[PDB]
Amino acid sequence: STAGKVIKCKAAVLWEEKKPFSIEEVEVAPPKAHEVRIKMVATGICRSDDHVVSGTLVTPLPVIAGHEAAGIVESIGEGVTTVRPGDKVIPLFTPQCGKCRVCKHPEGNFCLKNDLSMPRGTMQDGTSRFTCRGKPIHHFLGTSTFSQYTVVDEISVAKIDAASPLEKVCLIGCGFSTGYGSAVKVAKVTQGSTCAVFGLGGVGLSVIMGCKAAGAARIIGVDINKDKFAKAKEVGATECVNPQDYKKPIQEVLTEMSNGGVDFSFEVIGRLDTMVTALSCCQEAYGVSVIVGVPPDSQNLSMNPMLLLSGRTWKGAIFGGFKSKDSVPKLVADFMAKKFALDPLITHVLPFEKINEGFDLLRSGESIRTILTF
Amino acid sequence: STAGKVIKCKAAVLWEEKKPFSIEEVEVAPPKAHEVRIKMVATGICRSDDHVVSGTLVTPLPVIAGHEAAGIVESIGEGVTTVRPGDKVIPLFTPQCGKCRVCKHPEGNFCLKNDLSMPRGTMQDGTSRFTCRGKPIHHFLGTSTFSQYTVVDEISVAKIDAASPLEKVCLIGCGFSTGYGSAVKVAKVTQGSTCAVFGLGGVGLSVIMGCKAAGAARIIGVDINKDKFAKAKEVGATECVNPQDYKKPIQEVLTEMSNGGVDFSFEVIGRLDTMVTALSCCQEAYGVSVIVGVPPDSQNLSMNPMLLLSGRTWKGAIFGGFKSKDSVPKLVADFMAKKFALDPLITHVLPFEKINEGFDLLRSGESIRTILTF
Ligand SMILES: NC(=O)C1=CN([C@@H]2O[C@H](COP(=O)(O)OP(=O)(O)OC[C@H]3O[C@@H](n4cnc5c(N)ncnc54)[C@H](O)[C@@H]3O)[C@@H](O)[C@H]2O)C=CC1
Ligand SMILES: NC(=O)C1=CN([C@@H]2O[C@H](COP(=O)(O)OP(=O)(O)OC[C@H]3O[C@@H](n4cnc5c(N)ncnc54)[C@H](O)[C@@H]3O)[C@@H](O)[C@H]2O)C=CC1
Ligand SMILES: OCC(F)(F)C(F)(F)C(F)(F)F
Ligand SMILES: OCC(F)(F)C(F)(F)C(F)(F)F
Ligand SMILES: [Zn+2]
Ligand SMILES: [Zn+2]
Ligand SMILES: [Zn+2]
Ligand SMILES: [Zn+2]
């Protein structure tokens, strides 16, 4: 009924930094060859979307942000083979072209077709499917989920179980998969280990879930907002520490608590200082520290390389190291089989039109994930 | 016959930074409980010893430096069980106590009894076995091999094969094992990989040996001294580049040569800028970079954590990640079985009393390893 036609629909457009989203009418072009137009069902509010508003994460403006979502295929362009109209889907902010040297590497997931390194804010063909006020509007990470309809490249969508609950599994589109994979795949957390997780938002709680799944003995949650601790303990933190309660810097506290440093630390905030602290608190000879947080654009940290010379490993990852199009349908199948939980991450549900209240809930410290329903 | 007595002998004392070593008459105390007195047979001149002279590496002065050596046990203190008089030994600048959290960990080698992290320049008991005209002389990394005789803690010595040639296997006490293990144990270089090695001294040549042993298809040597390239190619470098030949940064050159980044990079110089260049030149999604070089004391590097967030792994190690007392004998056994060569590292052989000529050869760029013989 809409196939082959321009859709007029509502989207949350960001015209300028540090301004509220504008809910207004946009035009969504029909999909071209190897593109997929999706009716959005649910989208989460991830701190990275807030980083676009704050200018922490630089992408071309004006933009339709949003990258953690689930919906139903409205129509496919010529040549699409991996999804059909009416399929349930999760957009992939990290693509999986399956052809590039990274997609073919056993341990790589940062596909060379990504729009993260050198953001253009377009479809793969360098154009936009969105018009607003007669102007072209940029895409975000090849997803743009803060719209009733979006168009993505085939390499940026995965078909998921026909019976999945989209108002939950949208979190597999970013925050859950990222934290979980950061522990089980990137860190490769071991049975009986001691973990330190810096930041207890949706991504940090997911990291804790992965640390518990891996059989960690101790999981120490770290956050300056003690209101985060209860939920962190429910999903497996054995202890929580607030840096503001100690006279000593928290890497010293954690080193003592762990009898000379943790096996695995995670930075799940996005600050240069906590990236160095998290590295410092892992054991000097065999500790591993994983950066998950997104730091302010173009800013360098300063560190003493003697932290690494002693034996520490420092690494980072996008999307928990998961090859996105292979992994997302398996993660949904595992969720359906109750292998992990998503409800502990969901604190608030709002309609899409209340997106600005959703960003307020995050910025105040009150929410973990708000799910917007269309 | 000298057992239980003071030995008067010659040692090279460094009284002050940026001076020549001074050949002095010293007194060497007999070994106390769990100590081993060694008659030196050969010691290598490592750039780390030069770092003490230049002030790159801070350790209490005055000092007997030297840490890359082999000798024969002259006597043992009370309770020594792992060597006897007459045994061939290699002193271990990284100890293996076998009782600390690190020694018990499968990966870790940076034993908590080390004198590297917060150098005291003493025996384990906090005293010196060396006097020069009534003045105590500091130890270096619990080895002090620039002496006819030294005393080490039992956890800082390994018994090796009675038939081993000490004028070659002294290199297993630091430079060979550090470079070889950095490739084979720390990086875990893979078959068919591309490697880049920054610094083509004795330790960087040993990194090349390890990369070739691991079956790397491409091994790119990087040095500003093009006279190092011939020997690098002899031990397995497929290509060499001199950053001074190029109008653009060598990380860009290496990224284009490797069609988007190397699999494994090694910093084997000791400069902050080459540590960041080496990380940058490894592939952004799955590349691994190992720091081996010792940089100037208390200096921090500056880097963009986006280099790690994409997927890179950054690590460092001491002594190639080898658990020292377990590994040094097996490395000597493997040398005796022709598993690897040490002669390519040895460019000069001098008697001990020509130590300053040995350091002049290193500083001029002529030498790789000078072995000092007794
Ligand atoms: N690498 C990747 O693929 C991904 C990265 N991210 C990033 O991960 C980070 C976390 O995302 P969310 O969990 O959605 O964010 P969030 O904003 O819900 O949670 C961050 C937590 O950090 C705490 N915090 C702030 N300053 C702190 C400090 N100094 N010390 C300790 N805790 C502090 C806050 O109280 C908060 O609970 C963000 O930077 C986001 O951009 C998000 C997902 C994917
Ligand atoms: N982590 C560890 O356990 C160990 C660390 N080391 C350290 O490893 C490093 C190398 O030691 P050696 O091989 O004995 O030293 P070396 O001085 O023989 O070799 C260093 C090489 O770096 C090259 N070089 C200097 N500046 C350069 C630049 N800007 N760009 C490219 N090349 C440059 C030199 O021309 C030289 O060939 C030193 O810092 C040393 O202290 C040594 C052994 C053990
Ligand atoms: O939240 C996802 C994420 F990886 F952080 C991102 F949004 F893709 C990033 F990296 F911020 F661009
Ligand atoms: O060359 C040995 C070495 F590991 F580099 C050292 F000397 F111990 C260090 F690290 F320099 F202190
Ligand atoms: Zn996100
Ligand atoms: Zn790809
Ligand atoms: Zn130990
Ligand atoms: Zn050395």
Q: What share of chain A is helix, strand, coil (3-state, %, to 5)?
A: 30, 25, 45
Distance (angstroms) between ligand 7 centre and the Cα of B124 equals 12
B342: left (phi over 0), alpha (psi -120 to 50) or beta: alpha
- Beta-carbon contacts of A134 under 8 Å, excluding residues fewer than 6 positions away, are none
Strand A288-291, strand A264-267: pairing: parallel
Distance (angstroms) between ligand 6 centre and the Cα of A99 equals 5
Q: Residue B187 and residue A143: Cα distance in Å, rounded?
A: 36
Closest to B139 measured CA to CA, from B70, B6, B37, B18: B37
Distance (angstroms) between ligand 1 centre and the Cα of B284 equals 22
Q: Is the Cα dihedral B19, B23, B29, B30 positive or negative?
A: positive
Q: Residue B108 and residue B89: Cα distance in Å, rounded?
A: 23
Q: Residue B284 and residue B267: Cα distance in Å, rounded?
A: 17
What 8-state DSSP symbol labels residue A226? Answer: G
Cα separation values, A278 from A8, A46, A228, A249, B284, Å: 47, 22, 18, 11, 21
Across the beta sheet with B218-222, the strand order is A239-241, A218-222, A194-198, A264-267, A288-291, A313-316, B313-316, B288-291, B264-267, B194-198, B218-222, B239-241
SS (H, E, C) B13-61: EECCCCCCCEEEEEEECCCCCCEEEEEEEEEECCHHHHHHHHCCCCCCC
Q: Is the Cα dihedral A119, A125, A129, A134 positive or negative?
A: positive
Q: Residue A302 and residue A212: Cα distance in Å, rounded?
A: 32
Instruction: Provide the β-strand partners of residue B239.
Output: B220
- Beta-carbon contacts of A194 under 8 Å, excluding residues fewer than 6 positions away, are A216, A217, A218, A219, A220, A258, A262, A263, A264
CB A41 within 8 A of CB A71: yes
Distance from CA of A294 to the nearest CA of B (A): 8
Cβ of A318 within 8 Å of Cβ of B301? The answer is no
Give me B106's structure tokens.
Answer: 């499968």
Q: Buried b / exposed e across B166-195, counting CB within 10 Å, b at 16+? A: bbbbbbbbbbbbbbbbbbbbbbebeeebbb
Q: Residue A21 and residue A12: Cα distance in Å, rounded?
A: 5
Cβ of B105 within 8 Å of Cβ of A314? The answer is no
Q: Residue B227 and residue B90: Cα distance in Å, rounded?
A: 31
Locus of tokens 């949208």: A170
CA A274 to chain centre: 19
Q: Residue B128 and residue B121: Cα distance in Å, rounded?
A: 8
Q: Residue A64 and residue A327: Cα distance in Å, rounded?
A: 25
CB B199 within 8 A of CB B268: yes
What 8-state DSSP symbol labels residue A204? Answer: H
Angle at A282 between CA A278 and CA A284, to 5 degrees: 130
Give me A151's structure tokens.
Answer: 């168009």
End-to-end CA distance of chain A: 19
Determine if the peptide bond prior to A351 is cis (ω within 30°). no
Distance from CA of B295 to the nearest CA of A (A): 8
Locus of tokens 């004006």: A62
Which atom of ligand 4 is found nearest the CA of B94? 8
User: Nearest-CA residue of chain A relative to B100?
Assistant: A260
Give me B207's structure tokens.
Answer: 């990194």
Cβ of B316 within 8 Å of Cβ of A311? The answer is yes
Give the DSSP per-residue string, B159-179. E--TT--HHHHGGGGTHHHHH
User: Nearest-CA residue of chain A relative to B109?
Assistant: A285
Q: Residue B372 and residue B374: Cα distance in Å, rounded?
A: 7
CB A201 within 8 A of CB A226: no
Cβ of B112 within 8 Å of Cβ of A260? The answer is yes
Backbone angles phi, psi at A44, to 5 degrees: -90, 160
Tell me if residue B139 falls in helix, strand or coil.
coil
Is B200 annotated in a binding site? The answer is: yes
Alpha-helical (H) ranges within A47-100 are 47-54
- Beta-carbon contacts of A181 under 8 Å, excluding residues fewer than 6 positions away, are A210, A317, A319, A320, A321, A322, A327
Tell me if residue A200 falls in helix, strand or coil.
coil
Distance (angstroms) between ligand 3 centre and the Cα of B298 equals 34
Test mutation, B310, B312, B319, chain A, max A CBs within 10 A? B310
Residues of A assigned a catalytic role: 46, 48, 51, 67, 174
Q: Residue A306 and residue A300: Cα distance in Å, rounded?
A: 18
Give me A356's structure tokens.
Answer: 């600005």
CB B65 within 8 A of CB B17: no
Cα separation values, B67 from A48, B42, B146, B297, B335, Å: 50, 11, 8, 19, 20
Cβ of B310 within 8 Å of Cβ of A291? The answer is no
CB A301 within 8 A of CB A276: yes
Give me B9's structure tokens.
Answer: 């002998």
B294 to chain A: which residues are within 8 Å by CB?
A: 309
Give me B290's structure tokens.
Answer: 């190992």
Burial of A61 (0-12, 13-18, 19+ CB in 10 A): middle
Residue B12, amino acid: A
What 8-state DSSP symbol labels residue B68? Answer: S
What 8-state DSSP symbol labels residue A190? Answer: P
CB B187 within 8 A of CB B290: yes
Give chain B's largest Cα–Cα span.
Answer: 65
Give me B20's structure tokens.
Answer: 């020549």
User: Nearest-CA residue of chain B relative to A302?
Assistant: B302
Give me A75's structure tokens.
Answer: 């129509």
Give me A278's structure tokens.
Answer: 């998290």
Distance from CA of B321 to the nearest CA of A (A): 8
Closest to A22 measured CA to CA, from A364, A360, A353: A353
Cα separation values, B44 from A59, A318, B159, B176, Å: 54, 45, 18, 11
Tell me the best of A269, A318, A369 to mutate to test the pocket of ligand 1, counting ligand atoms within 8 Å of each CB and taking the most.
A269
Resolution (A): 1.5
B299: left (phi over 0), alpha (psi -120 to 50) or beta: beta
Does the C-beta of B174 come closer than 6 Å to ligand 4?
yes
